[PDB]
Coordinates of C-alpha atoms in Angstrom, one line a residue:
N1 CA 146.4 155.1 131.3
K2 CA 143.1 154.3 130.1
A3 CA 139.7 155.1 131.7
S4 CA 137.8 152.0 133.4
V5 CA 134.3 151.7 133.2
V6 CA 133.1 153.9 136.5
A7 CA 129.1 154.3 136.6
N8 CA 128.0 157.9 137.4
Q9 CA 125.1 157.8 138.4
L10 CA 123.4 155.1 141.2
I11 CA 122.3 151.9 139.7
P12 CA 119.9 149.5 141.8
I13 CA 120.5 145.7 142.1
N14 CA 120.0 143.6 138.8
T15 CA 120.6 146.2 136.3
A16 CA 122.0 146.4 132.8
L17 CA 124.5 149.6 132.6
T18 CA 124.2 151.3 129.2
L19 CA 126.3 154.0 127.4
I20 CA 125.0 156.9 129.5
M21 CA 125.0 155.0 132.9
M22 CA 128.7 154.2 131.7
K23 CA 131.7 156.7 132.6
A24 CA 134.9 156.0 130.9
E25 CA 136.7 158.3 133.9
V26 CA 140.0 157.0 134.9
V27 CA 140.2 157.0 138.4
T28 CA 141.2 154.1 141.3
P29 CA 140.8 151.0 141.6
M30 CA 141.3 150.7 137.7
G31 CA 138.6 148.0 137.9
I32 CA 137.4 146.5 134.7
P33 CA 138.3 148.7 131.7
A34 CA 136.0 149.4 128.6
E35 CA 137.6 147.5 125.9
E36 CA 134.5 145.1 126.0
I37 CA 131.8 148.1 126.5
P38 CA 130.1 147.0 123.8
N39 CA 130.3 143.3 124.9
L40 CA 129.3 143.2 128.3
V41 CA 127.6 146.5 128.0
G42 CA 124.1 146.4 129.8
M43 CA 125.9 143.9 132.5
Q44 CA 123.4 143.9 135.5
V45 CA 125.2 143.8 138.9
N46 CA 124.6 141.9 142.3
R47 CA 124.0 144.9 144.6
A48 CA 123.0 148.3 144.2
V49 CA 125.6 150.6 142.9
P50 CA 126.4 153.9 143.9
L51 CA 127.4 157.1 142.0
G52 CA 130.8 157.0 140.6
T53 CA 131.3 153.4 141.2
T54 CA 133.9 151.7 139.3
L55 CA 133.5 148.1 138.0
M56 CA 134.5 145.7 140.6
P57 CA 135.2 142.0 140.0
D58 CA 133.9 141.1 143.4
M59 CA 130.7 143.6 142.9
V60 CA 129.9 142.1 139.6
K61 CA 129.2 138.3 138.7
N62 CA 130.3 137.9 135.1
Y63 CA 131.3 141.2 133.8
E64 CA 132.8 139.7 130.9
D65 CA 134.6 136.7 129.8
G66 CA 138.2 138.7 129.6
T67 CA 140.0 136.1 131.2
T68 CA 142.1 133.5 129.2
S69 CA 142.9 130.5 131.3
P70 CA 139.8 128.7 132.5
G71 CA 140.9 125.7 135.2
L72 CA 138.5 127.4 137.7
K73 CA 135.4 127.5 135.2
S74 CA 132.2 128.3 137.7
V75 CA 128.7 127.5 136.5
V76 CA 127.0 130.9 135.8
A77 CA 123.0 131.0 134.2
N78 CA 123.8 133.4 131.4
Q79 CA 120.0 133.0 131.2
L80 CA 116.7 133.2 133.6
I81 CA 115.6 130.4 135.4
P82 CA 112.2 130.4 137.4
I83 CA 112.4 128.7 140.7
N84 CA 112.1 124.6 140.2
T85 CA 113.4 124.2 137.0
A86 CA 115.7 121.4 135.2
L87 CA 118.4 123.9 134.3
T88 CA 120.9 121.5 132.2
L89 CA 124.5 122.6 130.3
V90 CA 122.0 124.7 127.5
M91 CA 121.1 127.4 130.6
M92 CA 124.3 126.8 133.0
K93 CA 127.5 128.0 131.2
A94 CA 130.6 126.7 133.1
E95 CA 133.1 129.8 132.8
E96 CA 136.0 131.1 134.9
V97 CA 133.9 133.6 137.1
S98 CA 134.4 135.1 140.2
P99 CA 133.7 134.5 143.0
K100 CA 134.0 130.7 142.5
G101 CA 130.4 129.6 143.1
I102 CA 129.8 126.0 142.1
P103 CA 132.8 124.5 140.0
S104 CA 131.7 122.1 137.2
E105 CA 133.2 119.3 138.7
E106 CA 130.4 116.4 138.0
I107 CA 128.1 119.2 136.4
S108 CA 127.2 116.5 134.2
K109 CA 125.3 114.4 136.9
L110 CA 123.5 117.4 138.4
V111 CA 122.7 118.5 135.2
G112 CA 119.1 119.5 134.8
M113 CA 118.3 118.8 138.2
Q114 CA 115.8 121.0 139.6
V115 CA 116.7 124.3 141.8
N116 CA 114.8 125.2 144.8
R117 CA 115.3 128.9 144.5
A118 CA 114.5 131.2 141.8
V119 CA 117.7 132.1 139.5
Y120 CA 118.1 135.4 137.5
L121 CA 120.0 136.1 134.3
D122 CA 123.8 135.8 134.2
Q123 CA 124.1 134.4 137.8
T124 CA 126.9 132.8 139.7
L125 CA 125.7 129.0 141.0
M126 CA 126.4 128.7 144.2
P127 CA 126.0 125.4 146.4
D128 CA 123.9 127.7 149.0
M129 CA 121.0 128.1 146.3
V130 CA 120.6 124.6 145.6
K131 CA 119.6 121.8 147.8
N132 CA 121.6 118.7 149.1
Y133 CA 124.4 117.9 146.4
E134 CA 125.6 114.1 146.3

């Protein structure tokens, strides 16, 4: 089988991995492959990554758009938004990503709403970081 993207060195939290920190080794479990290496390269993680850590879906927010059928498109801040910032669909990208944070059900109504917490780059928007919805 093809090798997967397993980090050889240890990565801290929120760190874009590169070709040097990305090792294509054939280890299990076969998390995300390296076909989109040149696409999701520099992808930051949600928590600290140990040595030889394979790319996991639950450990990485939007590892890449390798999904086909959306349906469960979740809102993800592909960019960085400072606390209290009326973010709209432009800064928010409702795509199918895990885990299922906040689905774009009525986003058109909450779009441009000011957040009470700071938001980093591609981060999964959750109802725990926002105030009281409608």
